[PDB]
Amino acid sequence: GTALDQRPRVVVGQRVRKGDLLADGPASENGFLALGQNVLVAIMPFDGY
């Protein structure tokens, strides 16, 4: 039930060499394995939450 779609990553007329990225699939950021987010994190207790 996860959504599996692909998105175009190049624009009209772009000269692309062999193996260049034409579309990003699910959980893919410009060809890298995008299994989540990079968030800004603080490691400290917090009121019990």
Binding site: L35, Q37, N38, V39, V41, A42, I43, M44
Partner: protein, 97 residues
């Protein structure tokens, strides 16, 4: 921090309080300037933080960084369940699971 010194801002008072704290924590070398000491802390991956509710700094320096966090498939939207009465079994006439 050189961004800050150029923008025209001195070492905030709360950074002082936390710096004295972290000094009693053997985290900075005593006597160095606030910039020297904040750089010392930062290099340990710690920074000053201000409790958003109060304005006051955390009694001490706190590790802060960029992290890879993922959403796992197990979402609560899919698991919250509750029945008053429902369907029963054929032989046992107990509820289905």
């Amino acid at each position: 921090f050189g961004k800050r010194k150029g923008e025209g801002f001195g070492v905030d008072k709360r950074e002082v309080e936390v710096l004295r704290r972290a000094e009693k924590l053997g985290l900075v070398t005593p006597g160095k300037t606030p910039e020297e000491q904040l750089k010392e802390l930062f290099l340990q991956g710690k920074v000053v933080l201000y409790d958003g509710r109060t304005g006051e700094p955390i009694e001490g320096p706190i590790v802060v960084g960029q992290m890879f966090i993922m959403k796992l498939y197990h979402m609560v939207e899919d698991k919250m369940h509750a029945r008053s009465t429902g369907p029963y079994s054929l032989i046992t006439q107990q509820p289905l699971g």
